[PDB]
């Protein structure tokens, strides 16, 4: 069993790792830090050609907290997510000056961050491609994961696509299928009207597009409607998937939003996985 928890965005929640219920029967619990971005730290925010900066709050989610949570919970690993939607008010656009130059900067900067925070993995969450092309993105990301794995810096890697970005992610997946461990598909991207049957249709569509990739299901705990809601039939769909041998795991966006529901959903989903 795999459960994935995004954490550190939205900003200023105050949520700690220790705030989140961790079910001891889960085989793999992965925290995912959001985000490291290759943009300048302060406004106006501009692209840095793969020189990553830390946009989560290190005073709350730091190297000592990471060590402590892992020590307390042997099932816990921690990864970092690249990109995200926005930095400050500026849209995060994937941009490379050259493939070689971006990759060199990314490997140096990420290797430092990963070693410093005691991390086990990365996640890919770029969502805007207006200043790039699919091949350039596939090559940059593919070389980065492949290198980091070869150097022994990371154990695992994931991607977090959705239908409007599928073209970019499919290029990356078809080009580098052995470098990607699982796929945290963003089901919250679909309409609020989506039924149980339609969700299952979406899941099978995702499984087919990413053939032979392991696709996780997901929900949002955010204040805005998206997809098939967690408590409005998500568990029925999840149950059909489980009975069929089709449930790879569940991903949640995000611990920061979940403070308002008191982590009820995190607790429900983990219990569901392990039953």
State the CATH number of the domain containing residue 68. Answer: 3.20.20.80
**What residues does 76 pair with on adjacent strands?**
29
Q: How many Å apart are CA 22 and CA 119, to the nearest integer?
A: 18
- Strand bridging mode 156-159 / 121-125: parallel
Active site residue 5: no
- In the block, tokens 């992610």 appear at 169
> How many domains are contained in the chain?
1
DSSP class of residue 164 equals G
Q: How many Å apart are CA 127 and CA 270, to the nearest integer?
A: 28
Nearest to 77 by CA among 182, 147, 175, 162: 182
Q: Which string of b and e fits 129-148 if b means at least 16 CB within 10 Å? A: beebeeebbbbbbbbbbebb
Give the three-state DSSP class for 138. helix
- In the block, tokens 């092309």 appear at 133
**Method used to obtain the model:** X-ray
C-beta of residue 256 within 8 angstroms of C-beta of residue 33 = no
Entry resolution in angstroms? 2.1
**What residues does 156 pair with on adjacent strands?**
121
Tokens of 118: 């005691």
Q: Which string of b and e fits 196-222 if b means at least 16 CB within 10 Å? A: beebbebbeebbebbeebebbbbbbbe
Q: How many Å apart are CA 188 and CA 243, to the nearest integer?
A: 23
- Strand bridging mode 28-37 / 2-7: parallel
C-beta of residue 202 within 8 angstroms of C-beta of residue 194 = yes
Nearest to 114 by CA among 28, 36, 9: 36
**What residues does 30 pair with on adjacent strands?**
4, 77
DSSP class of residue 153 equals S
C-beta of residue 55 within 8 angstroms of C-beta of residue 28 = no
Nearest to 216 by CA among 246, 256, 180: 246
Q: What angle do CA 234, 222, 145 make, to 5 degrees?
A: 85
Backbone angles phi, psi at 184, to 5 degrees: -85, 75
User: Concatenated DSSP letters for 87-122?
Assistant: ETTEE-----S-HHHHHHHHHHHHHHHHHHTT--EE
Catalytic residue among 127, 139, 167, 267: 127
C-beta of residue 182 within 8 angstroms of C-beta of residue 218 = no
Q: What angle do CA 196, 199, 202 make, to 5 degrees?
A: 155
Q: Which domain holds residue 263?
A: 1-275
C-beta of residue 138 within 8 angstroms of C-beta of residue 177 = no
């Amino acid at each position: 069993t795999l459960f994935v928890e995004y954490i550190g965005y939205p900003l200023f929640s105050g949520v700690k790792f220790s705030d989140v219920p961790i079910n001891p029967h889960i085989t793999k619990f992965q925290f995912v830090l959001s985000f490291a971005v290759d943009y300048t730290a302060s406004s106006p925010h501009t692209s840095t050609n793969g020189k990553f900066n830390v946009f989560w709050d290190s005073s709350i989610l730091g190297p000592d907290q990471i060590s402590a949570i892992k020590s307390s919970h042997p099932n816990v690993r921690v990864a970092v997510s690249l990109g995200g939607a926005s930095v400050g008010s500026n849209t995060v656009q994937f941009q490379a000056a050259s493939v070689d130059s971006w990759v060199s900067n990314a490997v140096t900067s990420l290797t430092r961050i990963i070693q410093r925070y005691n991390l086990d993995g990365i996640d890919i969450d770029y969502e805007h491609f207006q200043n790039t092309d699919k091949n350039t993105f596939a090559e940059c990301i593919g070389r980065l994961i492949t290198t980091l794995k070869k150097n022994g810096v990371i154990s695992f890697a994931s991607i977090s696509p959705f239908p409007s970005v599928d073209e970019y992610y499919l290029a990356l997946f078809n080009e580098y299928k052995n470098a990607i461990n699982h796929i945290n598909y963003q089901f919250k991207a679909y309409d609020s009207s989506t039924s149980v049957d339609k969700f299952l249709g979406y899941y099978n569509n995702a499984a087919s597009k990413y053939k032979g990739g392991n696709v996780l299901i997901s929900f949002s705990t955010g204040p805005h409607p998206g997809g098939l809601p967690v408590d409005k039939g998500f568990f029925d769909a999840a149950t059909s998937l489980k009975n069929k041998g089709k449930l790879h795991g569940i991903a949640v966006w995000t611990a920061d939003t979940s403070k308002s529901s008191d982590f009820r959903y995190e607790e429900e989903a983990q219990a569901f996985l392990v039953s």
